[PDB]
């Protein structure tokens, strides 16, 4: 579980948002991508894998997660792919936060990263951003 991630692709304002959820912590990373292609998903995954121990990703079967460029990035980074309502829980939570801050950002992409911040930093002892590093740190 220290290295299991859920990745999903959702749409806001007629744009594409890539969402990665570290299932065990609820930590989120997200980005607005130019297009729903394997190329952009491979880039995102490569960045994700250089930050965190990414061992397995669960995605749906869209052409952007099964394409050739995604398969190669996962081979190179050493990530096994597989093809829950955890995704939907997070997409809804993220959309709600984006809606609440959107007026403070010239562009969607900025609002997305504001919402990711707000999500990862909020406490209830241990935010999701604190939980992910504690999970990993413990795994060493």
């Amino acid at each position: 579980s220290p290295g299991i991630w859920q990745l999903d692709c959702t749409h806001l304002e007629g744009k594409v948002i890539l969402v990665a959820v570290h299932v065990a912590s609820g930590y989120i990373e997200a980005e607005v991508i130019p297009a729903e292609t394997g190329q952009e998903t491979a880039y995102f995954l490569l960045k994700l894998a250089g930050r965190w121990p990414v061992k397995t990703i669960h995605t749906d079967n869209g052409s952007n997660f099964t394409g050739a460029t995604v398969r190669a990035a996962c081979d190179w980074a050493g990530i096994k792919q597989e093809f829950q309502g955890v995704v939907e829980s997070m997409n809804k939570e993220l959309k709600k936060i984006i809606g609440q801050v959107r007026d403070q950002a010239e562009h969607l992409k900025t609002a997305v990263q504001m919402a990711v911040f707000i999500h990862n930093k909020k406490r209830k002892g241990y935010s999701a951003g604190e939980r992910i590093v504690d999970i990993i740190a413990t795994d060493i």
């Binding site: 749409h11 806001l12 007629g14 709600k96 809606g99 959107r102």
Partner: peptide, 15 residues
């Protein structure tokens, strides 16, 4: 803003 289940959205905050 409000983002709906379908891809559409509104500038108005309904919730």
């Amino acid at each position: 803003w409000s983002y709906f289940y379908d891809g559409s959205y509104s500038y108005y905050d309904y919730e």
